[PDB]
Design an enzyme around this catalytic site. Structure first.
Site, PDB file in Angstrom:
ATOM      1  N   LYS A 186      41.431  63.941  74.987  1.00 37.26           N
ATOM      2  CA  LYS A 186      40.835  64.304  76.269  1.00 37.26           C
ATOM      3  C   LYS A 186      40.245  65.705  76.245  1.00 37.26           C
ATOM      4  O   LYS A 186      39.298  66.000  76.970  1.00 37.26           O
ATOM      5  CB  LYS A 186      41.871  64.201  77.391  1.00 37.26           C
ATOM      6  CG  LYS A 186      42.422  62.804  77.599  1.00 37.26           C
ATOM      7  CD  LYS A 186      43.188  62.696  78.910  1.00 37.26           C
ATOM      8  CE  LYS A 186      44.268  63.756  79.012  1.00 37.26           C
ATOM      9  NZ  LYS A 186      45.139  63.547  80.204  1.00 37.26           N
ATOM     10  N   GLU A 213      34.390  67.971  68.939  1.00 40.86           N
ATOM     11  CA  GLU A 213      35.820  68.221  69.049  1.00 40.86           C
ATOM     12  C   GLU A 213      36.057  69.599  69.659  1.00 40.86           C
ATOM     13  O   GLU A 213      35.293  70.528  69.410  1.00 40.86           O
ATOM     14  CB  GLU A 213      36.479  68.104  67.668  1.00 40.86           C
ATOM     15  CG  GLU A 213      37.843  68.768  67.523  1.00 40.86           C
ATOM     16  CD  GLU A 213      38.952  68.027  68.254  1.00 40.86           C
ATOM     17  OE1 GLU A 213      40.076  67.949  67.714  1.00 40.86           O
ATOM     18  OE2 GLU A 213      38.708  67.536  69.373  1.00 40.86           O
ATOM     19  N   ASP A 214      37.103  69.728  70.469  1.00 38.25           N
ATOM     20  CA  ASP A 214      37.379  70.993  71.140  1.00 38.25           C
ATOM     21  C   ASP A 214      37.817  72.080  70.162  1.00 38.25           C
ATOM     22  O   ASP A 214      37.389  73.228  70.274  1.00 38.25           O
ATOM     23  CB  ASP A 214      38.443  70.810  72.228  1.00 38.25           C
ATOM     24  CG  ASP A 214      39.728  70.213  71.697  1.00 38.25           C
ATOM     25  OD1 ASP A 214      39.930  70.226  70.464  1.00 38.25           O
ATOM     26  OD2 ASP A 214      40.542  69.735  72.515  1.00 38.25           O
ATOM     27  N   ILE A 215      38.660  71.725  69.199  1.00 36.82           N
ATOM     28  CA  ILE A 215      39.220  72.733  68.311  1.00 36.82           C
ATOM     29  C   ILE A 215      39.572  72.194  66.927  1.00 36.82           C
ATOM     30  O   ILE A 215      39.997  71.049  66.774  1.00 36.82           O
ATOM     31  CB  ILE A 215      40.478  73.380  68.945  1.00 36.82           C
ATOM     32  CG1 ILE A 215      40.824  74.700  68.254  1.00 36.82           C
ATOM     33  CG2 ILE A 215      41.660  72.416  68.947  1.00 36.82           C
ATOM     34  CD1 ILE A 215      41.950  75.446  68.925  1.00 36.82           C
ATOM     35  N   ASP A 238      42.028  73.423  63.900  1.00 41.26           N
ATOM     36  CA  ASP A 238      43.061  74.356  63.474  1.00 41.26           C
ATOM     37  C   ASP A 238      43.477  74.054  62.038  1.00 41.26           C
ATOM     38  O   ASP A 238      42.869  74.547  61.088  1.00 41.26           O
ATOM     39  CB  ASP A 238      44.270  74.283  64.413  1.00 41.26           C
ATOM     40  CG  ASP A 238      45.209  75.471  64.261  1.00 41.26           C
ATOM     41  OD1 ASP A 238      45.166  76.148  63.213  1.00 41.26           O
ATOM     42  OD2 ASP A 238      45.995  75.729  65.199  1.00 41.26           O
ATOM     43  N   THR A 239      44.516  73.238  61.891  1.00 35.88           N
ATOM     44  CA  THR A 239      45.001  72.838  60.577  1.00 35.88           C
ATOM     45  C   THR A 239      43.953  72.009  59.842  1.00 35.88           C
ATOM     46  O   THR A 239      43.839  72.078  58.618  1.00 35.88           O
ATOM     47  CB  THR A 239      46.305  72.031  60.678  1.00 35.88           C
ATOM     48  OG1 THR A 239      46.061  70.812  61.390  1.00 35.88           O
ATOM     49  CG2 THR A 239      47.378  72.835  61.400  1.00 35.88           C
ATOM     50  N   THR A 275      43.545  66.636  62.008  1.00 38.33           N
ATOM     51  CA  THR A 275      43.020  65.706  63.001  1.00 38.33           C
ATOM     52  C   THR A 275      41.599  65.277  62.653  1.00 38.33           C
ATOM     53  O   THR A 275      41.266  64.094  62.715  1.00 38.33           O
ATOM     54  CB  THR A 275      43.036  66.319  64.415  1.00 38.33           C
ATOM     55  OG1 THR A 275      44.376  66.688  64.763  1.00 38.33           O
ATOM     56  CG2 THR A 275      42.512  65.325  65.437  1.00 38.33           C
ATOM     57  N   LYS A 311      39.577  77.769  64.204  1.00 36.95           N
ATOM     58  CA  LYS A 311      40.604  78.706  63.777  1.00 36.95           C
ATOM     59  C   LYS A 311      40.816  78.547  62.279  1.00 36.95           C
ATOM     60  O   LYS A 311      41.751  77.873  61.851  1.00 36.95           O
ATOM     61  CB  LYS A 311      41.905  78.479  64.550  1.00 36.95           C
ATOM     62  CG  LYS A 311      41.723  78.561  66.058  1.00 36.95           C
ATOM     63  CD  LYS A 311      43.043  78.718  66.794  1.00 36.95           C
ATOM     64  CE  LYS A 311      43.937  77.516  66.615  1.00 36.95           C
ATOM     65  NZ  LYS A 311      45.140  77.605  67.484  1.00 36.95           N
TER      66      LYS A 311
HETATM   67  N1  LIG Z   1      45.551  73.963  74.012  1.00 36.00           N
HETATM   68  C1  LIG Z   1      45.482  74.122  72.571  1.00 36.00           C
HETATM   69  N2  LIG Z   1      45.602  73.052  71.812  1.00 36.00           N
HETATM   70  C2  LIG Z   1      45.546  73.142  70.478  1.00 36.00           C
HETATM   71  C3  LIG Z   1      45.363  74.379  69.891  1.00 36.00           C
HETATM   72  N3  LIG Z   1      45.346  74.184  68.562  1.00 36.00           N
HETATM   73  C4  LIG Z   1      45.513  72.887  68.344  1.00 36.00           C
HETATM   74  N4  LIG Z   1      45.636  72.238  69.494  1.00 36.00           N
HETATM   75  C5  LIG Z   1      45.832  70.810  69.714  1.00 36.00           C
HETATM   76  C6  LIG Z   1      45.959  70.019  68.414  1.00 36.00           C
HETATM   77  C7  LIG Z   1      46.463  68.606  68.709  1.00 36.00           C
HETATM   78  O1  LIG Z   1      47.037  68.571  69.983  1.00 36.00           O
HETATM   79  C8  LIG Z   1      47.410  67.288  70.402  1.00 36.00           C
HETATM   80  P1  LIG Z   1      46.545  66.947  72.017  1.00 36.00           P
HETATM   81  O2  LIG Z   1      47.481  67.250  73.163  1.00 36.00           O
HETATM   82  O3  LIG Z   1      45.314  67.816  72.130  1.00 36.00           O
HETATM   83  O4  LIG Z   1      46.140  65.494  72.073  1.00 36.00           O
HETATM   84  O5  LIG Z   1      44.709  69.931  67.797  1.00 36.00           O
HETATM   85  C9  LIG Z   1      44.678  70.543  66.541  1.00 36.00           C
HETATM   86  C10 LIG Z   1      43.802  69.699  65.628  1.00 36.00           C
HETATM   87  O6  LIG Z   1      42.460  69.966  65.917  1.00 36.00           O
HETATM   88  P2  LIG Z   1      44.157  70.184  63.873  1.00 36.00           P
HETATM   89  O7  LIG Z   1      43.049  71.086  63.390  1.00 36.00           O
HETATM   90  O8  LIG Z   1      44.224  68.942  63.014  1.00 36.00           O
HETATM   91  O9  LIG Z   1      45.479  70.910  63.808  1.00 36.00           O
HETATM   92  C11 LIG Z   1      45.240  75.498  70.736  1.00 36.00           C
HETATM   93  O10 LIG Z   1      45.050  76.781  70.205  1.00 36.00           O
HETATM   94  N5  LIG Z   1      45.307  75.328  72.048  1.00 36.00           N
END
Ligand SMILES: Nc1nc2c(ncn2C[C@@H](COCP(=O)(O)O)OC[C@@H](O)P(=O)(O)O)c(=O)[nH]1
Ligand SMILES: Nc1nc2c(ncn2C[C@@H](COCP(=O)(O)O)OC[C@@H](O)P(=O)(O)O)c(=O)[nH]1
Lengths: 215, 211
Positions: B80, B124-126, B128-129, B132, B157
């Site tokens: 979402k 995609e919003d973000i 990180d690792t 996803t 990130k």
């Molecule tokens: N609010 C917020 N959320 C974050 C942040 N960093 C990661 N997340 C969410 C994470 C999955 O969260 C499950 P959901 O609740 O969003 O479904 O997504 C990371 C994948 O993109 P990755 O790169 O594979 O690790 C952050 O700084 N702030």
């Protein structure tokens, strides 16, 4: 909120701020009109839910009703797909008015249920892009009501088309009214086309079957 | 347009007079975010404008077709946390004159079936690792076989990378902190905020109740 200029180009196509929209027959509402009515709608919604109370699910130890806060926000159900742009804009406007809320999406095409499970005794607002025949929302209201029994269940629509009603359904909140025509733009689609346009247009009848191919 | 960032009487982060008690600091205000996205929209536009892919509008045509309203750029958005970002982005794409369509997939679902030989872009919003997106990219590439498959993110990130994944398009780069606002959240809270904030660590577990 910038004032938009509606005109015609040399070819005779509807233009808005110099940009031509050949698929459009006329203009229902420019971006300025849309956002103005959504800002006032946000204030309307904020006033309607600000002092309301519903079941506390943040602290399950509590038995008394709880006000609408970050701990127990307003539950907003957004109807995929057309409502996702409408919803995105509106929740931010709701934030401006300081109304705590959370959004879960559902996909309906008269299929993809909610992830939220605590809707009982909660104040719930359904965010749908458009209401025409009223069948989609009528079916959705009684479904949510039967399966969850929320404290309240109201409907907010961007565009209402009352002239196209076939069932008895009235949205509590209505941002815009349109004539009984097929509209496109700002969420409204033709096989997913024109959804990202910033204005709501009346679609030319000769564009109704423009893209019949499966995406 | 530019936003005023300050502090109130209690040392809480304020943006345009409004206080944000859960914020440690501001990553980027609305004006910055939107400035970035407008530039990104231009970047995406210039990258896909002259591109050509499979014509499914007219299957009678065997030759490749340009990106038009007939054969639009296929955009995949991830529910979402990415819907607000996608909402703004597609409109900026409209400004830059790039035809596109959006389907949503929820991961924590695609109804489109004709991605074969198509240029596909993931919103995609973000990142990180990277786990996803690395999994999502591999799934699509073998179960749809697109002509191209690039990823556009709002927040990268790179200090968090633990797998082999680098998004082609990046709006904003942030440190390895947990952020909230404008799509990002903690148990769906703060998602509707117009700015991105570094979350106070104490607020990380403020809403443990299931929604
Ligand atoms: N609010 C917020 N959320 C974050 C942040 N960093 C990661 N997340 C969410 C994470 C999955 O969260 C499950 P959901 O609740 O969003 O479904 O997504 C990371 C994948 O993109 P990755 O790169 O594979 O690790 C952050 O700084 N702030
Ligand atoms: N683009 C566009 N679509 C319309 C319009 N009127 C109705 N629809 C269909 C549907 C939209 O949803 C997406 P889809 O899943 O149907 O494709 O909404 C159904 C309720 O209006 P209802 O008649 O009360 O059931 C319109 O003016 N423009």
């Amino acid at each position: 909120l910038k004032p938009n200029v509606v005109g015609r180009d040399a070819d005779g196509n509807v233009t808005v701020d110099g940009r031509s929209y050949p698929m459009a027959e006329s203009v229902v509402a420019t971006e300025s009109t849309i956002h103005r009515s959504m800002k006032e709608m946000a204030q309307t919604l904020a006033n309607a839910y600000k002092t309301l109370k519903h079941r506390d699910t943040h602290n399950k130890g509590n038995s008394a009703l709880a006000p609408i806060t970050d701990e127990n926000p307003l539950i907003i159900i957004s109807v995929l797909k057309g409502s996702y742009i409408f919803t995105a804009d509106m929740v931010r406007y709701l934030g401006d008015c300081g109304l705590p809320n959370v959004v879960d999406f559902i996909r309906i095409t008269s299929l993809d249920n909610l992830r939220f499970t605590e809707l009982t005794g909660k104040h719930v607002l359904i965010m749908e892009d458009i209401a025409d025949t009223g069948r989609t929302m009528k079916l959705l209201v009684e479904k949510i009501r039967r399966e969850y029994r929320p404290a309240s269940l109201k409907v907010c629509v961007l565009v209402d088309k009352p002239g196209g009603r076939v069932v008895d359904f009235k949205p509590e909140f209505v941002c815009l009214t349109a004539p009984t025509r097929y509209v496109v733009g700002y969420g409204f689609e033709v096989n997913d086309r024109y959804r990202n346009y910033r204005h709501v247009f009346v679609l030319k009848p000769e564009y109704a079957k423009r893209y019949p191919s499966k995406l």
